[PDB]
């Protein structure tokens, strides 16, 4: 849900799940390349 829980993952961890392939990883890399830029942190905690 939302962003953060998605934003921290290594591409080596995300690359292997069904249906992603190499294309969708670069797709989310392009979409999330804008705004957040992040694709990682250890952060702190969560409000919800």
């Amino acid at each position: 849900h939302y962003i953060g829980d998605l934003v921290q993952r290594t591409e080596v961890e995300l690359l292997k799940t069904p249906n992603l392939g190499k294309k969708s990883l670069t797709e989310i890399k392009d979409v999330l390349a804008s705004r957040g830029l992040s694709l990682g942190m250890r952060l702190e905690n969560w409000p919800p």
Binding site: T26, E27, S34, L37, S38
Partner: protein
């Protein structure tokens, strides 16, 4: 050596240095860091230009690595400190700089995306027909354009050019009776080396005499008061003291003479002989050509042939090609607006 402030250096930071510093600190993969380092060198002291994209992609030597990977990474690089960085074409520059308006800007977000994304090529002249394209009227569009005109361009904030690179002058031309007059302002072994100094000290006194001399002959060759400078050949200065052309051009190329107008020292000896009986070489031709083209075209005449006819009326024997070619150059709008 050490223990003193030798001119060891400063290690300042340019824009590419700083961008690379900014890449070091962001969560790029092994490859993406190679694309990032590949882009930040492509960037210029001017910002906007990231030059050709497909050469960025092809420079990596295939093996996969599509266009989209450099595109995303490229966007994120475009997002680093000086707001709009790199990108291309200024359009996407203003779209990235416009990417963060906080979205709480009234009327600006939408209108600004329409104007800045597309049709901005026609916004150069004025609004006019564009007002009918976007259906906007009055100050609704004018305020958005106030924001677009309030953006600035690219980087050139990092800069790191504190050095103005001053002239320091060399020889002063004290202005006389509507002209110029030169003044030129501004144990046994090492003892034998001392002797060389005597010769260097004797030549140092004549160094100013060469500047005042060649300067006096240069003042006699070209009229100061006259428009531009009277056409002269290096054969005149080579006639006076009997010096070689390359030597005189080298002295005038290294040192720079300060007169009351122009700092411009080696350009006062370079001229053409025109090869015509009816006649200031190319200086007044291009200069006065752009001056005559300055006040002209009541609306949009854009006629270089009329300017060539005006130059032919002055008795310069214009070719209607050479005159138009030299006149239309150096940012001259002439012949371009037609």
């Amino acid at each position: 050596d050490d223990e003193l402030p030798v001119y060891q250096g400063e290690t300042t930071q340019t824009l590419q240095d700083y961008l690379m510093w900014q890449v070091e600190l962001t969560p790029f993969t092994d490859t993406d860091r190679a694309i990032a380092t590949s882009i930040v060198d492509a960037v210029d002291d001017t910002g906007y230009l990231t030059i050709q994209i497909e050469d960025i992609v092809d420079s990596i030597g295939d093996d996969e690595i599509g266009l989209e990977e450099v595109e995303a990474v490229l966007k994120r690089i475009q997002r680093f400190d000086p707001v709009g960085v790199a990108a291309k074409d200024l359009r996407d520059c203003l779209l990235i700089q416009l990417s963060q308006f906080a979205k709480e800007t009234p009327w600006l977000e939408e209108a600004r995306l329409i104007i800045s994304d597309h049709l901005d090529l026609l916004a150069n002249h004025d609004f006019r027909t564009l007002m009918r394209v976007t259906r906007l009227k009055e100050e609704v569009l004018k305020e958005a354009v106030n924001l677009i005109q309030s953006l600035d361009x690219x980087x050139x904030x990092x800069x790191x050019x504190x050095x103005x690179x001053x002239x320091x002058x060399x020889x002063x031309x004290x202005x006389x009776x509507x002209x110029x007059x030169x003044x030129x302002x501004x144990r046994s072994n090492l003892q034998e080396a001392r002797w060389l100094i005597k010769s260097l000290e004797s030549a140092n006194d004549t160094l100013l005499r060469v500047s005042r001399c060649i300067v006096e002959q240069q003042q006699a060759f070209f009229e100061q008061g006259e428009e531009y400078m009277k056409p002269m050949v290096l054969a005149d200065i080579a006639q006076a003291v009997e010096m070689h052309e390359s030597t005189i051009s080298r002295v005038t190329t290294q040192k720079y003479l300060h007169s009351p107008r122009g700092i411009x020292x080696x350009x006062x000896x370079x001229x053409x002989x025109x090869x015509x009986x009816x006649x200031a070489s190319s200086t007044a031709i291009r200069a006065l050509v752009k001056k005559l083209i300055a006040a002209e075209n009541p609306a949009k005449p854009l006629s270089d042939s009329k300017l060539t006819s005006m130059l032919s009326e002055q008795g310069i024997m214009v070719a209607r090609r050479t005159v138009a070619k030299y006149r239309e150059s150096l940012s001259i709008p002439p012949s371009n607006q037609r």
